[model samples]
Target: GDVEKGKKIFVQKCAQCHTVEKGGKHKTGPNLHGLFGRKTGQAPGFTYTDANKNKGITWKEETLMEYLENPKKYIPGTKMIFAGIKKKTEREDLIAYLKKATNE
Candidate 1:
């Protein structure tokens, strides 16, 4: 996948909120290190919404694709705060960066 493009996209869109670096600060959004394979709202340092805590799906590429495509729709009542990426290619590309960046 296009990880480089994804990184740029992330910087423009997600950087203000999410942090993919290890032990990063929990800012407007939860830090995203170790995001993959984790259940929704599992970041212990960040307090999540009741709807988010109730959302039980684990993170994965496909799941990320769906969630990021339309966060409001995917988990109703849980606002991701950021509006979603509607384009499939953009979403996949961003997730490509997230997959590598979050885990590394």
Candidate 2:
């Protein structure tokens, strides 16, 4: 996937609510720094619902695709209002961008 396309996707789709850049902060959703290798509901200070915290998940490229394609379906009670990215390539690009930005 193209990182530039991913960055664009992130900016257009997720930047409003989440932060993946190195120094994390909440934007309504939460900071996604180090998200790929982590468990769910771990972002400090984000007011997450029980459904999100209760779902035992390990975030990664494979698992993220499922969630990013359908947020409400992946975690039934998740408070995020996003409809999710339906296009496969867009998802891949977003994940690729996340891989680098979240670590930087």
Best candidate per lDDT, number?
1
lDDT of 1 by residue, 22-49 (tens): 9889988899999899989998789888
Top model number, TM-score = 1
Error of 2 at 55 (Å): 1.0
1-104 per-residue lDDT for model 2 (tens digits): 79998999888888898888666789889898878788899887888999999889899899999999999999998999998898899999998998988877
Minimal lDDT window, size 10, model 1: 74-83
Q: Give the TM-score of candidate 1.
A: 0.95
Using all chains and alpha carbons, the TM-scores for the candidates as numbered come to 0.95, 0.94
Alpha-carbon runs more than 4 Å astray in model 1 = none
